[PDB]
Scaffold this active site. Sequence first.
Site, PDB file in Angstrom:
ATOM      1  N   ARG A 122       0.849  -1.186   0.000  1.00  0.00           N
ATOM      2  CA  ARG A 122       0.000   0.000   0.000  1.00  0.00           C
ATOM      3  C   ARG A 122       0.887   1.238   0.000  1.00  0.00           C
ATOM      4  O   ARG A 122       0.446   2.301   0.434  1.00  0.00           O
ATOM      5  CB  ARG A 122      -0.990  -0.040   1.222  1.00  0.00           C
ATOM      6  CG  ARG A 122      -0.252  -0.134   2.564  1.00  0.00           C
ATOM      7  CD  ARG A 122      -1.282   0.164   3.617  1.00  0.00           C
ATOM      8  NE  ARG A 122      -0.728  -0.028   4.939  1.00  0.00           N
ATOM      9  CZ  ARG A 122      -1.423   0.214   6.056  1.00  0.00           C
ATOM     10  NH1 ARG A 122      -2.694   0.661   5.953  1.00  0.00           N
ATOM     11  NH2 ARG A 122      -0.894   0.009   7.256  1.00  0.00           N
TER      12      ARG A 122
ATOM     13  N   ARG B 267       6.295   9.600   3.925  1.00  0.00           N
ATOM     14  CA  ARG B 267       7.356   9.181   4.833  1.00  0.00           C
ATOM     15  C   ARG B 267       8.720   9.411   4.182  1.00  0.00           C
ATOM     16  O   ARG B 267       8.939   9.034   3.032  1.00  0.00           O
ATOM     17  CB  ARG B 267       7.160   7.690   5.142  1.00  0.00           C
ATOM     18  CG  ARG B 267       8.261   7.118   6.033  1.00  0.00           C
ATOM     19  CD  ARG B 267       7.844   5.772   6.653  1.00  0.00           C
ATOM     20  NE  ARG B 267       7.718   4.805   5.578  1.00  0.00           N
ATOM     21  CZ  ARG B 267       7.133   3.619   5.696  1.00  0.00           C
ATOM     22  NH1 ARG B 267       6.666   3.214   6.864  1.00  0.00           N
ATOM     23  NH2 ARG B 267       7.022   2.818   4.643  1.00  0.00           N
TER      24      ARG B 267
ATOM     25  N   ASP C 162      10.152  -7.889   8.454  1.00  0.00           N
ATOM     26  CA  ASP C 162       9.917  -6.886   7.427  1.00  0.00           C
ATOM     27  C   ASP C 162       9.729  -5.490   8.002  1.00  0.00           C
ATOM     28  O   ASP C 162       9.734  -4.508   7.222  1.00  0.00           O
ATOM     29  CB  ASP C 162       8.704  -7.234   6.561  1.00  0.00           C
ATOM     30  CG  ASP C 162       7.457  -7.564   7.377  1.00  0.00           C
ATOM     31  OD1 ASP C 162       7.542  -8.571   8.144  1.00  0.00           O
ATOM     32  OD2 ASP C 162       6.391  -6.895   7.194  1.00  0.00           O
TER      33      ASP C 162
HETATM   34  N1  LIG Z   1      -4.535  -2.209   3.479  1.00  0.00           N
HETATM   35  C1  LIG Z   1      -3.501  -2.849   2.886  1.00  0.00           C
HETATM   36  N2  LIG Z   1      -3.521  -3.121   1.554  1.00  0.00           N
HETATM   37  C2  LIG Z   1      -2.496  -3.761   0.992  1.00  0.00           C
HETATM   38  N3  LIG Z   1      -1.408  -4.294   1.605  1.00  0.00           N
HETATM   39  C3  LIG Z   1      -1.423  -4.025   2.924  1.00  0.00           C
HETATM   40  C4  LIG Z   1      -2.404  -3.335   3.620  1.00  0.00           C
HETATM   41  N4  LIG Z   1      -2.127  -3.287   4.964  1.00  0.00           N
HETATM   42  C5  LIG Z   1      -0.991  -3.979   5.080  1.00  0.00           C
HETATM   43  N5  LIG Z   1      -0.507  -4.435   3.863  1.00  0.00           N
HETATM   44  C6  LIG Z   1       0.712  -5.218   3.569  1.00  0.00           C
HETATM   45  O1  LIG Z   1       0.809  -6.252   4.525  1.00  0.00           O
HETATM   46  C7  LIG Z   1       2.175  -6.427   4.930  1.00  0.00           C
HETATM   47  C8  LIG Z   1       2.274  -6.275   6.442  1.00  0.00           C
HETATM   48  O2  LIG Z   1       1.712  -5.000   6.860  1.00  0.00           O
HETATM   49  P1  LIG Z   1       2.568  -3.995   7.767  1.00  0.00           P
HETATM   50  O3  LIG Z   1       3.701  -4.715   8.422  1.00  0.00           O
HETATM   51  O4  LIG Z   1       1.553  -3.384   8.728  1.00  0.00           O
HETATM   52  O5  LIG Z   1       3.150  -2.859   6.663  1.00  0.00           O
HETATM   53  P2  LIG Z   1       2.510  -1.439   6.298  1.00  0.00           P
HETATM   54  O6  LIG Z   1       2.033  -0.647   7.524  1.00  0.00           O
HETATM   55  O7  LIG Z   1       1.497  -1.521   5.169  1.00  0.00           O
HETATM   56  N6  LIG Z   1       3.739  -0.665   5.655  1.00  0.00           N
HETATM   57  P3  LIG Z   1       5.297  -0.238   6.115  1.00  0.00           P
HETATM   58  O8  LIG Z   1       5.112   0.885   7.149  1.00  0.00           O
HETATM   59  O9  LIG Z   1       5.958   0.241   4.831  1.00  0.00           O
HETATM   60  O10 LIG Z   1       5.969  -1.452   6.687  1.00  0.00           O
HETATM   61  C9  LIG Z   1       3.032  -5.443   4.132  1.00  0.00           C
HETATM   62  O11 LIG Z   1       3.363  -6.135   2.945  1.00  0.00           O
HETATM   63  C10 LIG Z   1       1.985  -4.388   3.825  1.00  0.00           C
HETATM   64  O12 LIG Z   1       2.312  -3.529   2.715  1.00  0.00           O
HETATM   65 MN   LIG Z   2       1.894  -1.299   9.700  1.00  0.00          MN
HETATM   66 MN   LIG Z   3       5.290  -3.099   7.866  1.00  0.00          MN
END
Ligand SMILES: Nc1ncnc2c1ncn2[C@@H]1O[C@H](COP(=O)(O)OP(=O)(O)NP(=O)(O)O)[C@@H](O)[C@H]1O
Ligand SMILES: [Mn+2]
Ligand SMILES: [Mn+2]
Length: 463
Positions: A84, A167, A241
């Site tokens: 996202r 960011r 990650d």
């Molecule tokens: N609403 C969403 N739509 C698509 N992918 C999502 C969404 N929310 C989470 N993800 C994906 O799910 C995975 C785990 O989410 P997370 O660890 O919360 O990352 P994030 O908050 O989307 N981004 P980042 O701050 O770049 O790490 C990552 O690959 C995300 O990009």
């Molecule tokens: Mn997150």
């Molecule tokens: Mn994340």
Amino acid sequence: TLSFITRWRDELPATYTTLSPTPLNNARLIWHNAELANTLGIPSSLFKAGVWGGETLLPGMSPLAQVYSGHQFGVWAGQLGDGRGILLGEQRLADGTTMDWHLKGAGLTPYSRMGDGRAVLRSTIRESLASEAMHYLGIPTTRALSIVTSDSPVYRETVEPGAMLMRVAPSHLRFGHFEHFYYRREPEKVRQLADFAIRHYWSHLADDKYRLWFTDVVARTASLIAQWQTVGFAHGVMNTDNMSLLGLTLDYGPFGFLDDYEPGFISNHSDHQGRYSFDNQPAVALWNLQRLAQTLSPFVAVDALNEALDSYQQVLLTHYGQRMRQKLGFMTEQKEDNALLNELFSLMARERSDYTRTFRMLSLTEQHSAASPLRDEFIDRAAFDDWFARYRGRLQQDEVSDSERQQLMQSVNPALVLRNWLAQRAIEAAEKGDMTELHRLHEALRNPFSDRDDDYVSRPPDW
Ligand SMILES: Nc1ncnc2c1ncn2[C@@H]1O[C@H](COP(=O)(O)OP(=O)(O)NP(=O)(O)O)[C@@H](O)[C@H]1O
Ligand SMILES: [Mn+2]
Ligand SMILES: [Mn+2]
Ligand SMILES: [Ca+2]
């Protein structure tokens, strides 16, 4: 006028997909970081949704979503990626450094895994406040440059307004980038990432480079977690990650800065086993580093990987111990220090004492005086007075004035932290269109070591 480059795109091929952001409906800019915008050289005219909502590209930008993988809650999750978010470009600054501009909430990408590609206003606000707060506490972190909100419905537990955070960070490299290509059986891409990282962020290393580099990766993660422990920051989602290669705090979600001192605090309500409780952060980050080490073994000698991993404990404990001594105003190291701090933490835990206010009030201590605003904060005042008498008696061994010690303590013990209740009040007002609280709170968080005469220093309501 700004200078952008396509370093990631060109030097790390096949690690991303190029694509544009998807604008939200009726997006509007509601906040931007003027001070950071100044340091980046951004003309004030660019804030008058535009690039901040993915609706405009600046010269040299080439947006792309990165692929990566992760261990989530201790188990291998496989490919995750920028589901996202989009790296709009890499900004080259006048001193030769480079800053990512990553638009979080930018829309669907190949990595969205059936998610909507969106971020929500409440979480963009929280991430902007916590990351800027962390920066001004002096703790490495991603930064927040702008927030846009919109009329687009985004469905979570309830319907939310879709929002985007710009960011900024020197890199979004994650432990999970390395894991991604290790498990996809692409060892030369793992090595390409490592050499990319060294070229651009450890450039001083002549071509023993990998031993020294990975020793410093370990050091920076050990230092990061030591700093979180000292201020009471609980991340809540230390999946691999969300571990920055550079040792930045990365991905603010269900985090919390402690209100009451609770060593086992679980900030993330989905963390049903407490894997990411506050007191587990030092063990977890070592486990994350061990998973990163495994990916490097095709080209880093195992003795070197283990020499780096072995150093984690001492780096962490030395940083943590020296910082806690500052917080206590221990201006020389003495034998009774560890016991005095263990006694204080036991007192605080049993009294559910406020973490930040305890240390800030402690910074007013007059070594030859038993009076203190702390006395009234303890139900068991006699136990407090006993500890405080022995604490001040030990302070006197330093041979330092109250003036000098109070100056040190007030420079390291914040008067305020980004408490959940403060962020929530800013969110409620922003959701109704009123950005005054968001702006005021951001301004206060730029000055965490100064005392205040408003409620930003207050504990949350008991009810
Ligand atoms: N609403 C969403 N739509 C698509 N992918 C999502 C969404 N929310 C989470 N993800 C994906 O799910 C995975 C785990 O989410 P997370 O660890 O919360 O990352 P994030 O908050 O989307 N981004 P980042 O701050 O770049 O790490 C990552 O690959 C995300 O990009
Ligand atoms: Mn997150
Ligand atoms: Mn994340
Ligand atoms: Ca309480």
